[PDB]
Structure formats: C-alpha cells, structure tokens
Amino acid sequence: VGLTDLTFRLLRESFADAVSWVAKNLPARPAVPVLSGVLLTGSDNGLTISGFDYEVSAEAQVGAEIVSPGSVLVSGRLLSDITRALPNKPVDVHVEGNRVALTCGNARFSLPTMPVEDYPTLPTLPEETGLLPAELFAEAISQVAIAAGRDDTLPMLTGIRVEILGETVVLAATDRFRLAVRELKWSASSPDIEAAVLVPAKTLAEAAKAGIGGSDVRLSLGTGPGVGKDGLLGISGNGKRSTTRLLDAEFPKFRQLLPTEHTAVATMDVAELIEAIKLVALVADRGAQVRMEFADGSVRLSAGADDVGRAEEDLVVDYAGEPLTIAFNPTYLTDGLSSLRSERVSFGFTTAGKPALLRPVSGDDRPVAGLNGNGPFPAVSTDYVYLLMPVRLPG
Amino acid sequence: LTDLTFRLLRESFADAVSWVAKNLPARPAVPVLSGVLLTGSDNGLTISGFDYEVSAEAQVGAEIVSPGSVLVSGRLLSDITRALPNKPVDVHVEGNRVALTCGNARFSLPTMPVEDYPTLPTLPEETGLLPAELFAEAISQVAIAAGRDDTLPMLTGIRVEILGETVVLAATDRFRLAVRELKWSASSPDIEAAVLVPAKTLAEAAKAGIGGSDVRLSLGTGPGVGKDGLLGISGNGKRSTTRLLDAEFPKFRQLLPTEHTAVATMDVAELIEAIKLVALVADRGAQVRMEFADGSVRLSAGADDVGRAEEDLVVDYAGEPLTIAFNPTYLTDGLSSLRSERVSFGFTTAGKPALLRPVSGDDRPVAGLNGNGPFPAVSTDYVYLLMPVRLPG
C-alpha cells in the first residue's frame, strides 16, 4: 500500500548506524510478531527507520537519496545483521513489491516483506521541556544507573527518578542498598518548570549513547501544567530520537536518608582502593563481604572465610575521627567507587550500622575543618553522592 | 627446622602457575586433585598438576631459602597470583597454612595433605624435537577438523604418525579431514610408529611452545615407542604428559583424490567474507552453495522465508561447470587453516569431497587447457578434505 514502491541509495556507513540504534532498543522477542519488523520510510530527501515495542520506540533519520517514496516493513534483526556485514560500498535498496532487493557491490539480497499496515503508529512525542549537553547527560546517567535495581519481580527500584526544579535537574536511582544522586544544570523551556517522573532505567541509559552526536540532547516531557500528563518521556538530538513510557510508581522519599553530619570522615585514593578490594575479595566467602578497620592514618581491609581463606591489605587513609570498623558488599563498594569519576574519594560514616557516604574529591578543598576528631563534621555540598548500606552475614 | 619457603618474581610465579591450571581444569574427580604442588629444592621451584589423564609441571627460577613441598588449592593460587602487584612475592609455609606476601598484601591460604597427592607420571624417553612455532602452527591446522563430541572418542584425537625424519598429523570429525606433513629431528633415524593423542591436551601444549623455540616429543625410543602408554611434550621451562588414546583411526590415505575433474583457485580473504555474508540468511546456518562456471563463482544461501542472498566473485577455474554445496563453517574453518594467500579446490564429482590446499605464487594454477579431462593431485604439506552437504525437504 502507498501507490508507488520505495527505492533509495544510502551510504551503508550511515545506513548501518541508523539501523542498529533502532534495534538496540525494543530487543527481545516482541509479544506480537509484527513488532519484530522495522519500518523504513522514504520521503522529502531523507529516510527514517522506526521501531516500536509498546514500551519504547526509537526512530533514526539519515540523509539518503530517495529516488522513489514509499514505506516497507522488514525483519529488524536480519536487516541489522546484513547492514553490519556489508562492504563499504553504497547500498541500493529497492522494493520489488512484496520483497526488498538489497544491493551493495556484487552482494545481492532478497528479503521478504512484512505487512506495513499492521504496524501500529509509533507515539508522537511530547513538547520540548529542556536540553543539556550530550556528553554530560551520558556521564550523569551512568553514575546514577549502577544503583538501580535490575530485578523485575519489583519495579520502582527499576527506574531512575528524574526531578526537574527548573534550571536544576536531579537524578536518583536505588536498589535498596545503594542510592546514587546526581545534580545537574540544564537550559529549561519555562524557567518555572517543576515536576518529577520515574523512567525505566535501561531505556534511559541506552539513549545516553545516541548522545555522542547532537552535542546537545533534549528531554521532552511536556511543558507548563502538563509535564506529568502525556504519560511518556522523549529523548531527541542529532539524528536519533526515542520515547519511553513512564513508570507509574512512588519512589523513596530519599533526601531524608542523607547524613547532616558525620562522626568520622576518611579520604584515600580511588585507584589504590579498588585494586585492594578486588584483591582481598578473591578469598571473600562466596564474595559476600569485605571489612575496613579504620585507625589513625591507615585502613586495613580484609576478607576471609570457611577455609578461613584470610587475606588483608593495608593502605594509607587521610582519616579524621575515632577508630571505626565497617563492612561492605565488595561489589556495591566498587560500583560506587567507579562512578565518582574522580581522582580520590571521601567517606562519611555516622555509626557502623548506618550508610556510608561516598563523594568525589579533587584538590585539597576540605579538610579545612577536619582537625576536631572529637566531634561531628559538616555534610558539605556535592553534585554526586553514593550512599552505601553496610552489610551483615548469618553464622 | 622449617617447611618450604621462597622468593619468586611474581611475573615468573604467575606464568608458571597458570600454565599448570590451564591443563587439568574442570572439577577433578577426587578432591585432592584440585591442588597444585609446589616443591623447593636445588635452586628452583616446580609447580605440578595432575588429573589422571594429563599432568603438567612448570619449573621457574626462584631463590628458595628453605626446601620442602606443599599442596595448595590450584584455582585460588592462580587467581591470587594474577591479581597481585608486580613486587616480589614471599611464600612461606607456617606449617598447615601458606603465608603469601607481596608488598602490603598478605594472604593466609589453607593447606592440603601433600601425602594424598599420587606421584605424577615419569615421562618416557625423548623421541625427537622440532621448532616450537612450527609445532603450534601445525597443531592448529589439524585440530579444527577433530571431533569435539565425547559420546565418541577416536574422532576426538589427533593421529600422530612418525616415519623417522617426517611426521604426519591427521584429525577428522567424519566431515573434514585435516592432514599436516612435517620435518623434525628424530632420535633414531629409523623410528616408526603411530599413536592417537586427545586433541585438546595437545593444542593446549602448543602454547607452552613460545619459549623453548624447540619443543620435544617423548613417546619412547626404538621398539618401545608405542609401549609406555603416553606422550610427553617438553621445552623451555614447561613440560606435560597426556595418556594416549587406545583407538583405531580411519585408514585415511585411501580417502584422498588421485586426480580431479575440476580445479578452482580464488582469493582466501574475499572468499571468507563472501561466505560469512551470504550465510546470514543461511537457513539455521545449514548450507552455502557454489555455482562454478568459466571464470566466476556465485555463492548463495536462501531459505524458508526464502531469505535469498548471493555474491559473485572471480575464480581462476578449469574444468566443466560444477555446482556444489558446503556447510559454511566447515568451509571457513578449512579456509582459515590454509594459512595462505589464496586457495585451491579439487573436485571430483559433487557428492564427493572437495580438496582444499594452499597456493603461494603461480606454481600451477589451472595453467590453461591442461586440460578439461582429469588434473593431477599435486603434492602438498597441508590438505583439508571437506565433504559436501545435504538437507531434507
């Protein structure tokens, strides 16, 4: 259907990219068989590939000499496999009605065709709500996404919380053992904009790589009194764009959970501390736990087991407060430590049954008021925080 | 008096240890066998592993400040040895526990009873030797064609045949035959037996031949090359033994073509890419087909969607038009192994094995109207024989 049949000439380099970006979303085995197709559409002077699985929906637009408009549905994985395995010659697509003739050099393909009238019109895309640099959005989404619950038996934990307080945005995710919070400055579209939504975590992290080009990605939730309404979020920028259906769940109150002051405060090198963790945990005890003895200007981490496999390492910590001994799940620990994206790290303990607080450290800012070992230290502002619960094992 | 203790460079300790755990992997049957055995003596340390089939043993130069031996869990040692800094490592048996120390890293590993470890095999007398890099190349070329399936051994081994001065390697999964011909320096120029060694055990030992620049097979010598039911690869610091396989192996020289009705010659590079591409639509991967005509071949797979792909490339061909079908993996496996610039096919009919062999420089490549009627087999040191394929309706 359409009247004519689609035919075009794309550069392959460009065809292959556009196609993979669309299959990287909506993977899996879609529920209704049709949804496994992608949709190519020639018009104006550009081609648009489109995918849709009812939750997410991607769509790329590449510049291609179309020598005849139309649209066709063709199996999506097959197109992606072929597009990546082809030479680097220009590729000649041409619908011979019911079959797609694909040609690139002396390679010739005859793919079957899916009924382009069972494809259910991918969503529209709410009105722009603001924008921010693409590389910064990526960094910010990775930092927060680690702490998101990967388990499907329970959503809510599976989302990133996006809160907009016009001009600043804050990202937060949590699996119940970690909290990652990122604070951000974007260019809003209505400087009095003010809502908060919950978007599925992977859908969002995936779209943080369609932000390499664009050098400026744009969130589209809605504008004004209808930012919530319109049950979805839209990431656009460069040639790519996507929508993900928002998550209808309430998310931990969460500012309540942060420390106001810390009884102890440490500061060692991230590099060294990671290596030291990956090493003592080899004997870990099914990987369960690593422990940190904090004293004077040194910390001794140590795991050990049912063989009593015992390992320990000592490194120098710029410490302040009374000797403290705390235990962490070693993965949660290194996850947080990778994310700080910094040279060195700063721990903030209340007691040893209460969340440690990791945040980054670049240059000797503070210290400053870190001499008075005998009593509470200030929280101190920061744009990235990782809150890590301490761990317990049974006998 | 005191228990083993020593000082190794880590770089050297880590290598020696991994080489011993790369063999005898899995979950050994008797629990003890999961340990490795460190032994200090003379002025060298030797790690030893053993699983009843294979048995490796590396020897590294280490300042031992006290001789002895201890058994410690093998995977744990390998994990630790690879995760340690680059400082010198201080092992020291505090009897019942091994104290391992490398910088400010300190480990206290448990100890296994070194008297349940069952004395690893002795190693038959040297039978010959050949360059290590050539032995590796030759083992990879022949090993692809070996059957990976355990329901049936025999297909699982490489056939090593020695005809003093020349050795030949052969493996087969029943659909491919790879044969490699080799010149080594024997120990008794009238040496003459043939044995079957498990295929992986041998390919694994083809990487403990990077150093040594000269690896040495030890089956026995004279009238007792067969007897002594095992093979021994040594060289550099490493050495291993593998228990030989007691099976008869396809008669196999019978299966080669004397003459070919057709003979083709195209570029290996182009042909591989072309195969990997048309097989995307392959039909569960089952088959690729080659139409041979004049000076061009058109490969093409297609399916139940009829997913149809095809590509045309230029073949230096000689004989009457032929159309043959191969399993595409078997095909590219063979094609990788030729280790050559270009390839030469040798077809009898189209229900009979093609013959792949390498081509470097215009020695004989069609060479015109030889011609049409039968072509010569032509000697070669590496041959890949690939059965054509059939699918059911």
Author numbering:
A (entry chain A): 8 to 402
B (entry chain B): 10 to 402
Give passages from the manuscript:
The sliding β-clamp polymerase processivity factor adopts a doughnut-like ring shaped structure where the DNA passes through the positively charged inner hollow of the clamp. β-Clamps are essential for many important DNA transactions including replication and repair. Structures of β-clamps are known from diverse sources including E. coli, T. maritima and S. pyogenes till date.
The structure was solved using molecular replacement (MR) techniques employing the structure of the E. coli clamp as the model for the calculations. The comparative studies demonstrate that the peptide and DNA recognition region(s) in the Mtbβ-Clamp is well conserved compared to other clamps and no obvious differences could be detected in these sites to ascribe the lack of interactions of the Mtbβ-Clamp with the LigA. We find that the mycobacterial clamp also has specific affinity for DNA and exhibits about 1.8 times higher affinity for primed DNA compared to nicked and dsDNA respectively. Mtbβ-clamp itself exhibits affinity for components of the clamp loader complex. Surprisingly we found that no direct interactions exist in vitro between MtbLigA and Mtbβ-clamp. The results therefore suggest that other as-yet-unidentified factors/mechanisms may mediate interactions between these proteins and DNA.
